[PDB]
Design a binder for this molecule. Structure first.
Ligand SMILES: Nc1nc2c(ncn2[C@@H]2O[C@H](COP(=O)(O)OP(=O)(O)NP(=O)(O)O)[C@@H](O)[C@H]2O)c(=O)[nH]1
Ligand SMILES: Nc1nc2c(ncn2[C@@H]2O[C@H](COP(=O)(O)OP(=O)(O)NP(=O)(O)O)[C@@H](O)[C@H]2O)c(=O)[nH]1
Ligand SMILES: [Mg+2]
Ligand SMILES: [Mg+2]
Lengths: 166, 166
C-alpha cells in the first residue's frame, strides 16, 4: 500500500508531539515530556485510498543539526509547526524550511505551515502574518489545537494531499 | 471582512445541497428536494481569519445553460461534486469544468473535486480514478459524506485555502 513518510519539525515546545499523539492515539498530552525521536505508523483511509502514515516526531533542540539532515533526506512531506503564542518559534520556521530545501535540493518540497495552540487567548502571532509567510512560500497555512483537536486531521491530511500532487 | 463567493456545481442528485446544509445547518437532509437556486451566507473563522462564506447552491439540470454563465462569472471558487455510486455524474464533471474555464477565461480557477456519498457500500467510481482525474486537473480531490459529515468542512475549507493562494 502507499506509505507516506511524514516528518513533524519545529521549535522546542510548540506541540509537535501533542499534534501527533492526538492523530494516532486520540488524547491530548498535557505534560512536559521532551522528545528525542519517536516514530508512529498507522493504517488509515484518506479520500478513499488505503494508506500507511509513517510519522517521525522530532526533537526541536541543538545536537540534532546533522542528525536532522538524515530524516529530512528521507521525509516526503513536512509539517512545519510553530505556536501562536510564541513569536521566536514563528521566526524559527525560516531556518527549518531553508534546511529542508538544502538537503532535498528543492525549492518546492511538500510542506504545510501549522500555527498550533490556537485554543490559547494570548496570541502573539497574528493569523495574517502567518498567512502571508505561507503564501510567500507557496504552501498551505493551517491553525490547530492539539488540545481541542481543532484542525489536527486537516493539517496531516492536507500534507498527504500535497505529497499526492507533487 | 474577507468574503469568499463559493459555488457548488455538479450533476442532479449528487448531494450539492446536502453538503451545503450540513456545513451551514448541521443536519443531513434525507429527502428528495430539487434545487432551483439557493444562497447561504455564514460568518466563520478559518485558520484564524474572520470571514464570510457566501455559498451558491445550484441546480444540476437543463434550462440553466446560460443561467450558469452568470454564476460562474462571479464565483471565486467551485466545489465540483459527483457521487461515488454514479458514474455518469463523474463523467459529467468534465463538462462543468470546461464551462467554468470558458467563462473565467482561465485554466486555473480555484476548484476542489468532491466525491460524495462515500458512506455508501456500492461504489462504481474508484478513488484511484477520481484521484488521477484531479491530478490531471491540478486540483485537490476530497471524498465526503453529507450523511456522516465526513470530509464536509475539509472540502469547503480546502476550497477557501485554494482561493487564498491563487
Ligand atoms: N493549550 C495547548 N497546549 C498545547 C498544545 N499542544 C501542545 N501543548 C502543550 O505544550 C507543551 C509542549 O507540548 P509538546 O507536544 O511536548 O511540544 P513539542 O514541540 O513536541 N516539544 P519537544 O520539541 O521538546 O519535542 C506541553 O505542556 C503540551 O501539553 C495545544 O494545541 N494547546
Ligand atoms: N447516503 C448518502 N445520501 C446522500 C448524500 N448526500 C446526499 N444524499 C441523498 O441524495 C439525494 C440528493 O441529495 P441533494 O442534496 O438533494 O442532491 P443535489 O445534488 O443537491 N440535487 P439537485 O441537483 O436537484 O439540486 C437525497 O435523497 C439526499 O439525502 C450522502 O453523502 N450520502
Ligand atoms: Mg515532542
Ligand atoms: Mg440541490
Amino acid at each position: 500500500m502507499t506509505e507516506y513518510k511524514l516528518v513533524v519539525v519545529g521549535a522546542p515546545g510548540v506541540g509537535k508531539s501533542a499534534l501527533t499523539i492526538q492523530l494516532i492515539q486520540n488524547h491530548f498530552v498535557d505534560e512536559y515530556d521532551p522528545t528525542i525521536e519517536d516514530s508512529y505508523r498507522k493504517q488509515v483511509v484518506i479520500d478513499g485510498e488505503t494508506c500507511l502514515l509513517d510519522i517521525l516526531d522530532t526533537a526541536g533542540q541543538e545536537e540534532y543539526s546533522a542528525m536532522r539532515d538524515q530524516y529530512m533526506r528521507t521525509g516526503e512531506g513536512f509539517l512545519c509547526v510553530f505556536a501562536i503564542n510564541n513569536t521566536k518559534s514563528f521566526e524559527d520556521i525560516h531556518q527549518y524550511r531553508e534546511q529542508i530545501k538544502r538537503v532535498k535540493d528543492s525549492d518546492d518540497v511538500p510542506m504545510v505551515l501549522v500555527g498550533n495552540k490556537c485554543d490559547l487567548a494570548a496570541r502573539t502571532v497574528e493569523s495574517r502574518q502567518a498567512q502571508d509567510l505561507a503564501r510567500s512560500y507557496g504552501i498551505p497555512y493551517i491553525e490547530t489545537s492539539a488540545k481541542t483537536r481543532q484542525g489536527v486531521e486537516d493539517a496531516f491530511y492536507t500534507l498527504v494531499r500535497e505529497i499526492r500532487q507533487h
